[PDB]
């Protein structure tokens, strides 16, 4: 049994705390990284073409990609190696509208998140979550560009296949590495939480500073996504848009830079 929540209304972000106690704490994500007051990575398998068994799902809150190949990330001050589980997205409203969760201040039309766990001391991601243990997350910004980005063809085509809440599809082969910035060098590090309920404060973040290009055209498949809302005794079909959590406060936290 999970608490009903949304990105607006009586169950919007500022009301998550009332049903999810962890949402009202400190060390919450996202935040606003300040570059003026800021301050190696090894990726295993990111260079591989994904499986035809790797699939996509409209969860009604985001679009999720269940990865079914072995991807690892080591370094960057992480407590060991971490193995990728899933990918989720956050987008705006229209015409490149801000929709990213992190930022400085400069938000981007889309933010993508890759979630990890440590398999050296766990068997599945979902066991890690249940046990409130440390997980890793990447945050990758997408910025508008004049020209299409073919690296993202499998993803966009995926979007068109999961328009409605609960819909699923398989994905054409894609290369996870090229879903990352051209320059991996500049990124940041801090301790945070899940950006959704239960907002478990168990997450080590990586925010790559440089963004990945997308076209306005590719961007539109994000704005074509629907969801549902279970309000009272009326279920309705709604646009899934602006599905980002407000930026939180750092408190006793400092960001690293590399």
């Amino acid at each position: 049994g999970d608490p009903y929540w949304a990105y607006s209304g009586a169950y919007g972000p500022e009301h998550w705390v009332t049903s999810s106690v962890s949402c009202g704490g400190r060390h919450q994500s996202p935040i606003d990284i300040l570059d003026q007051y800021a301050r190696e990575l090894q990726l295993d398998g990111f260079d591989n073409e994904s499986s035809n068994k790797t699939w996509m799902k409209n969860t009604g809150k985001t679009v999720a990609i269940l990865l079914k190949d072995d991807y690892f990330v080591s370094g960057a001050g992480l407590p060991g190696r971490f193995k990728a589980e899933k990918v989720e997205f956050h987008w705006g409203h229209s015409n490149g509208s801000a929709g990213s969760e992190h930022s400085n201040g400069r938000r981007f039309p889309v933010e993508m998140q890759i979630f990890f766990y440590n398999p050296d001391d766990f068997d599945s991601f979902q066991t890690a979550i249940s046990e409130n243990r440390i997980i890793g997350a990447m945050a990758i910004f997408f910025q508008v560009s004049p020209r299409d980005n073919s690296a993202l063809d499998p993803i966009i085509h995926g979007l068109k296949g999961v328009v409605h809440h609960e819909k699923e599809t398989f994905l054409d082969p894609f290369v996870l590495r090229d879903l990352l910035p051209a320059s991996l060098g500049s990124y940041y590090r801090y301790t945070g939480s899940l950006t959704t309920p239960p907002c478990s404060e168990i997450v080590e973040w990586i925010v790559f500073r440089r963004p990945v290009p997308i076209s306005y055209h590719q961007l539109e498949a994000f704005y074509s996504i629907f969801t549902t809302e279970q309000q009272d005794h009326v279920k309705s079909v709604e646009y899934l848009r602006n599905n980002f959590r407000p930026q939180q406060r750092l408190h006793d936290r400092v960001v690293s830079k590399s």
Binding site: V163, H164, H165, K167, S224, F226, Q231, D232, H233, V234, K235, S236, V237, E238, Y239
Partner: protein
């Protein structure tokens, strides 16, 4: 059973479901006062969930909706407190793929000679059109008919020959979606 239905505000062109409440009973929906909603391609009442499905809201739909549930045991009808619904002024909702919102199960056992009724209805703008067909490509025998404005498939006198995979297709100008399910036999 008695609760206070808050007035719900929807959008023109928006796909909407009005939930009844409880799940061997028969369901109907009256509008404003007793007695019934005109069902058609745009509006559908499920005997399986009890709910009222409005594929695309028209301004005419503004009003009070209340769900009367009757108990097969008797002729007793127990009304719910009506849900009044209005229109938002802030914007019309655009066109989009059909979304099948109520449908027959992935697998459906059926007693010999019984009458099986497969439901399939979809929210969509424009209003979806439902089509039926077998998966194996074999055409339906004559005893199968399209009830409820194509929202239901009725197989009377269910026999072993009637087993197999049934597909439900819902489409409009913006795309199509599909409900599938295998019917099985038992005596």
């Amino acid at each position: 059973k008695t609760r206070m239905r808050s007035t719900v505000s929807v959008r023109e062109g928006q796909g909407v479901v009005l939930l009844c409440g409880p799940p061997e009973l028969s369901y109907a929906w009256v509008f404003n006062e007793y007695p019934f909603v005109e069902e058609d391609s745009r509006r559908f009442v499920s005997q399986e969930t009890g709910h009222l499905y409005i594929a695309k809201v028209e301004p005419s739909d503004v009003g009070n909706y209340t769900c009367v549930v009757t108990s097969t045991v008797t002729n007793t009808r127990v009304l719910g407190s009506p849900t009044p619904l209005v229109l938002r002024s802030d914007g019309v909702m655009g066109e989009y793929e059909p979304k099948i919102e109520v449908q027959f199960p992935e697998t459906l056992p059926a007693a010999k000679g019984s009458t099986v009724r497969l439901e399939c209805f979809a929210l969509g703008n424009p209003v979806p059109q439902i089509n039926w067909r077998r998966s194996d490509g074999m055409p339906f025998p004559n005893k199968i008919k399209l009830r409820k404005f194509n929202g239901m498939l009725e197989i009377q006198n269910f026999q072993q020959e009637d087993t197999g995979s049934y597909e439900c297709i819902a489409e409009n100008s913006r795309g199509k979606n599909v409900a599938r399910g295998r019917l099985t036999y038992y005596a």
